[PDB]
Write a protein that binds this ligand. Sequence first.
Ligand code: HEM
Ligand code: HEM
Ligand SMILES: Cc1nc(CO)c(-c2ccc(Oc3cccc(OC(F)(F)F)c3)cc2)c(O)c1Cl
Lengths: 374, 98, 80, 422, 240, 27, 73, 58, 444, 65
Amino acid sequence: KSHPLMKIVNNAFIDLPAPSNISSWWNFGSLLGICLILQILTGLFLAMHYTSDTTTAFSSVTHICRDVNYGWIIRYMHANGASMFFICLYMHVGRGLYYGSYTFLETWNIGVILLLTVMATAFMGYVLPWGQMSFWGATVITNLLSAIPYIGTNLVEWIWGGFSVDKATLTRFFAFHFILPFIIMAIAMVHLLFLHETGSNNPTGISSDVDKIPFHPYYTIKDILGALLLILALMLLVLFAPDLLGDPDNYTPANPLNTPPHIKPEWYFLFAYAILRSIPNKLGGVLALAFSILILALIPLLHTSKQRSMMFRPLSQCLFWALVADLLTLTWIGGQPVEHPYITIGQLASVLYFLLILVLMPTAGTIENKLLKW
Amino acid sequence: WLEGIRKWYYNAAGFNKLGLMRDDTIHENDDVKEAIRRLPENLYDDRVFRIKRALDLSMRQQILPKEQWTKYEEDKSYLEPYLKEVIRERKEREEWAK
Amino acid sequence: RQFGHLTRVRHVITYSLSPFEQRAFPHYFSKGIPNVLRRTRACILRVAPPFVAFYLVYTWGTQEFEKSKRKNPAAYENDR
Amino acid sequence: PPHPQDLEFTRLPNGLVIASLENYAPASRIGLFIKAGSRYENSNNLGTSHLLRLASSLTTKGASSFKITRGIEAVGGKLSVTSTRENMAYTVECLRDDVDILMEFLLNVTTAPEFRRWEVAALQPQLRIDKAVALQNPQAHVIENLHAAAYRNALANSLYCPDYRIGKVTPVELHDYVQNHFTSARMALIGLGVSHPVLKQVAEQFLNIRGGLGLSGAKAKYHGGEIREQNGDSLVHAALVAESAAIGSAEANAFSVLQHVLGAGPHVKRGSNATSSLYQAVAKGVHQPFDVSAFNASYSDSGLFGFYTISQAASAGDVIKAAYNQVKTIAQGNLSNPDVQAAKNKLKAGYLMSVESSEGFLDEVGSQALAAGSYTPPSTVLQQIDAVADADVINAAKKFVSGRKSMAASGNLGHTPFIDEL
Amino acid sequence: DLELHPPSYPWSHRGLLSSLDHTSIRRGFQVYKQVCSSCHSMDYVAYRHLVGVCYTEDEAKALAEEVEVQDGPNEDGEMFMRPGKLSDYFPKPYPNPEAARAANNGALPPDLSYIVRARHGGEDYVFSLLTGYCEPPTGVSLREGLYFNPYFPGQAIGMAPPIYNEVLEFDDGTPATMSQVAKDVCTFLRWAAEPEHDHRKRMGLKMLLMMGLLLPLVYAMKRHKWSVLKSRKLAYRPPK
Amino acid sequence: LCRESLRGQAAGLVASVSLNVPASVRY
Amino acid sequence: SHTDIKVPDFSDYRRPEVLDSTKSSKESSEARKGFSYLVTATTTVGVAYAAKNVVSQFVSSMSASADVLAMSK
Amino acid sequence: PTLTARLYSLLFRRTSTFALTIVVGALFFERAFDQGADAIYEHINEGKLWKHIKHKYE
Amino acid sequence: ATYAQALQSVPETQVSQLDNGLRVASEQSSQPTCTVGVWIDAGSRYESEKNNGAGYFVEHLAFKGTKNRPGNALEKEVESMGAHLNAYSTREHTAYYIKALSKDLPKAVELLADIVQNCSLEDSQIEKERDVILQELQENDTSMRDVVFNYLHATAFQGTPLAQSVEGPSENVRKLSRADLTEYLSRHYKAPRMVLAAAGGLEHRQLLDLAQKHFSGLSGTYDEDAVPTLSPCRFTGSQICHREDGLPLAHVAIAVEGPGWAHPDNVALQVANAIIGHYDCTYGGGAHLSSPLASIAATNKLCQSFQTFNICYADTGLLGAHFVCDHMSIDDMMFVLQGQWMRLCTSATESEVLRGKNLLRNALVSHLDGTTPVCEDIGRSLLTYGRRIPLAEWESRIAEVDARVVREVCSKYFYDQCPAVAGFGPIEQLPDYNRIRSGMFWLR
Amino acid sequence: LVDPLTTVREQCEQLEKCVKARERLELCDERVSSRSQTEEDCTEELLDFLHARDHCVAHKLFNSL
Ligand code: HEM
Ligand code: HEM
Ligand SMILES: Cc1nc(CO)c(-c2ccc(Oc3cccc(OC(F)(F)F)c3)cc2)c(O)c1Cl
């Protein structure tokens, strides 16, 4: 007839009541999107020429860069896009943590999920080119599962499809890496679906139903401008510093007989790599590394301040930035070889991480109420 | 003394700069929602506007002139007497179902 | 939930002006930069310490990593 | 100025009146007045008038509900329906070049309405609206009550449908009502800005429907008594009247003069009603916002006369009494010739003015064409006003103060008196 | 376990908009073809790739027909040699890593296609290695076939110092010094590792000018739209 | 609806519904 | 009263050309609109250029590579 | 009228013309920008490019 | 005897002038009663910030007796002779008029002159009317139409005189003293800035001699730079949103800048306003209504009432519409309404124009029925147009208006114009101004 | 023919830190070269020198080319 009825499904895109006062920190979800779609579109066009076979896997990427028309652009846009996505992710999560948005429990948890999936995808993505870091990254990272008692050791080989990270793996890793983005895109819609039950939080942490504005034209134009900047940021990397966030070892084809000197996972993982390397025990390291990401699920149970947002919460406010700085620290420490003093600073940073979230920040919130006669 | 520290922290939290009273920033929740419903036309309609102006301020990223700031001495605890009841009724309702 | 069913608001007047009837960037630097500087002022004591702290520990830990990689003490040491 | 024309007049074989002023206006106004008001509703088919009033422009024989609505508006005409307790007045307006189409559309609505069950049923809840729209005016209640307190049979009927009847009105009852009451012996065709020949030609050919009164009205058996609706408004409305005289009798005139002696209504904007007897008699002893005026109803069958009080909460007791004493001491005969001669002027002018604009004129020509037989030029009425002696006035006042009592009150009625407390 | 990091030699293509020197690429190629094509594979480059960078099609084809490359199989199912053509990838020094190791002192000369990107510091490194060769200081002895280069990690490189003064002579007849060679072969290896370099940076500029144009324009529309909200005034008017 | 100006105020009832003109309670 | 309610003064944020509370706006509107719709038009031109450029790139991605063309001869 | 005012009523008033304007203007723009920034780059990197050292080998 | 010819037999209104300036104006019919009044260019546009609310105060006191007839004599003399006396103030006009019997004309004309000239302004009466008006403003405060209209004026003409209410800020009413009122009166009630209009049974020259009799005695000229000049009032695209949820229905008024009493377009604009029309829930038409907006509104119950308007002033006006509706129908009503504006602007159908033309044709003629109408016309015609205008002329002006013209004319004042919007009540649904503004151009 | 480098090196290792490092290259050299069976080397100090030198070297070597 017209296809007229479900365009009026954009009541949650056009005439959606938005808070008047959400800062640029709310701009990030849009951008995470832009990242997802960009990643998918580029990824498709890479998958047009890439080959998952160990014998041709490197050779393909190179053909993409060198001989495929504009291939290099697509390849780098994908590779830095990957980083942009992760920055956007950490910003996006931070936002939630600072403004308490984690009270939107489902939305939040769906997020916690999304994050893990994106991590998962991006991990596999990095193996695909079959470079030194691609291989040993997978061998080092995956192997950790064989810390799980009894079954882990088999589990790992079931993952690998053999006795080492091999062609058997590389081919399936491509298959998953191709699919996951979509599962992520589906989850995303759930993630949204649960948010617009409640509408967005705002910096104050005070219910904004008294003062709503239509998403269009206000938050559309804001988000176009927001995207524009992410585009600038990406294109700067792609066109000026295409290897900035990249490791050089991965420009030498994988070799299972010769391990690189300083094995590290790509930047957005480092902070957890550090936390894993803090603990001496194999499994301890693994479970610590797990908790390090899973504690996002615990966060909502740890809120104690009678105020929703940190805006009016001095103590918390510091401890938060302390957390960010500690994550930066751990990120730097994870980049360095495990030698003095990095191992101690590693220790203290790691213990600080969990001390902040589990012990300190909840107390800060309590005291903060005591101080306001709550 | 504590009453100095409380006085500092009140001013440090700094919702006052937006012309807000403490009970305007309380985390919305069943008890709170109920208390609020119980509020009288005036006490409600005031809260309405304090928040309505505070949000608008927050959107412009500016604050009120030092004079119109909420004063510690004059900060009404308007929502407290209502809420404490709402709570106690629910505590009673649990106690009974025990 | 949408316009009409959001909440109950009583006795408030909102005056506004057409985007074509007003300036896009009013008192931009005139009123901006001071507000910016007050804003920076407000939060900096809360934001910066953690990062300064990072800056000390970073350079300390790096120069320190550099000491330990250099030569040990040398007044006749690998013998005597 | 132009040269005034003879308001023509014919009375066809079957008692159907036709009148036409050819005043050569650009505007043409045509009314068809029918004796089909509330008074002819029985104790069963109540509201059927009120619905019938809203029911104009529902699909007719020759023109569909659409055709009717779009057709008139295509030339910018107007179809109005004007109901008295006694007379329904289907009155059309347009430019003198479209007269025949507005005429046509009018005759379909009156002589050939179909009243299709699905239209009639879908129009019903309009009654609900149009009623509550009219009952905004606290007067409407008081007046609707007043008649139902005063009379019993015919004029006791409300102009608006009773609540219980809203929705219950059947398409057969409209067929019946129309067939029984839209008859040659109860109809007057009035034309303003149209020649007599065509108004004849149209009425002879297309209005000649069986002219024997299908029902007849009752004789309005006066009861008298009080209705009081306690409803807590800021003010209190209360009307108190008595059995007056019918229209067409020189005794009505007496009440018409007696009215303007007591209270007419505002003549000067913002004024303190200085000349108004009632207002001035209640402009004493009560230091309040208040209002009072002389109510004077006059039908062909009967008539009501008294006063209407819009007083304070607790001032009701005072206003209604004080206004009454003032009428009493007129029945006792405290009435100087200047007071009669002012009132005669107020009525004499007040009349001449009310027929000034074509809208009233037509209603008066129709009114006379139905209630009496012929048109009676202003001069004769103005003369009849002068024919009223100073006796007839004080005798009308006497007939009030002595006559049987009717009262209708609504508001907060805690300090409002009853007929026996008066 | 101690390491010397390269200095910041300022290349003609160093800066954010600065392109490669195609002359120096042209020279640098000859340095590969003469000095290293005998131990260092450059598997990902073919003669055609040179056309329109540092050589004409004719020059490039002439550079191809210079070399015998294998082909086949023919009618009899036998592989046979033929002269190279534009579409041939640079000839390899060995058949395999094992032959490569065994023909050196168990040290395999790494492929040079991506070497500039495969090592920290890049050309600044490669130059510094190539030219930085020196004497082992009192205390350091070495294995035979190992040479001391302070820029290499571990300082014991398996590579015979590959360039000295006048190791070849250039077509344009530039001073065939050592350091003038290293520079040119680095400027080439850079291109080899990143053929897009020049175009990438040209796009960069266009992106810059474009963002420069748009990013205010859009912000302006944002503020044009938001004005209505940023200017507004609220008025509380409760009665009694 | 607002209240004050009452000086011989109520009309002296005619009900009048119509097509165009909004329904009036004259008198 | 509702007539005590007087509109606040926007002469702080107003466009110069409509500052005179005794001069008709109808002149300046012509230019005022044009000016702002210009920003949009240009933004759109730049955007169009931009898009045009990355589209055709991604498209070109799919035509025969210099690799395939090498043999085309 | 000023350039903005005339531009409005001539090109921005009718949404048909507005788009056409954007089209024409984008067409004219593209070449101008391309050609310009190209020449700016080619100057910035003067002498270094194959188009600058081409003539020497023909 | 056609409508074309019917316009011919209309008495051509007669107009004379006095040496002292006062214009005399009259339309003669054989009407036994007649209307006669004084019309004056004075009011809340001529008022200023400090003296706002005075024209109203004078209009109040004017009937509380003069010097020649003290107390309530002026009232009694008019009450007792049968005739009616009325008055009104607006933002641009002031009128004091009497409906009388023809024979009373000479007695009538005299009283008006007394009311205008020899007004008492009793110092005890001022304190009596002060209490009146103060309560008169409380009434308006619960009459949403008035409130929203005053708002519309306020935010449409913000910072100018026109933005001012005729009643004035409650402050002023409580602090206006005789000095202000008398000065206003003397400075504004000038004989060249006045008209004496009459219609019905009377011969022109009878009035003129009565004006020479009683009005020659009025202030007949003016001093040099005291009788003021009118500043054009700047129309500002803006919004005023009184959000009061407690109220049962939402009122909204939206309008673009009109042309002014001056402009010839005011015909084609009226013809256009007629096409979109007007409606309320008691109309018989319902779905079958000719105005798409009306029929939509009716079938869907979008509103319980809406009316288009062209309020006119000297060099500017308000051209738009008002609706009253349920707290959930505002957006839709707005959308249908703007939709109609745009559809008119871009594609007015030919016949639907002819529908307007006739509606207006009817409007003006059936408007000028009585004396009270025609006197009021003649009184104002001279105060605005400078003449009175023939129905046969208005007819000529209308008969020229066709689709192309309606389009050009609507497109002139609507298409891509910033409107002024006043909203009062449960208006949480009322669209954002950025959105409403987008309802004025192409289509989404 | 002689190398632009082999000049700019001589010209560079003039500067105070070069000679200062080279000095301790001999000062640590006594340390090691004079003793019997010790396993130290002056690599570190050679690199200490070479760095200080080549920083300079790089600063201008390229002007010759
Ligand atoms: C979901 C978000 C995505 C992320 C975070 C992501 C991440 C990555 C990363 C980090 C790489 C390595 C890039 C490199 O070093 O060159 C990569 C490679 C690749 N990705 Fe993705 N990817 C995403 C989506 C997709 C999608 C949807 C597809 C296919 C439809 C895809 C196909 C590929 C292919 C073929 C490669 C190999 C080419 C190469 O080496 O660059 N990716 N991905
Ligand atoms: C695929 C990655 C992600 C996408 C595409 C995504 C998308 C979105 C979008 C579009 C919004 C609304 C705009 C905004 O308010 O920022 C949103 C809100 C939110 N997301 Fe995400 N999200 C992602 C990851 C996450 C993660 C990792 C978390 C937490 C673990 C999370 C938690 C939230 C929360 C709490 C909100 C609402 C907070 C608020 O309204 O202020 N999301 N998400
Ligand atoms: C508060 C707030 N809310 C929402 C949605 O409720 C959005 C928002 C706006 C536009 C959006 O459009 C998109 C575009 C691409 C992907 C997308 O997602 C996905 F992946 F499809 F689920 C959403 C998605 C979300 C926003 O930008 C802000 Cl600031």
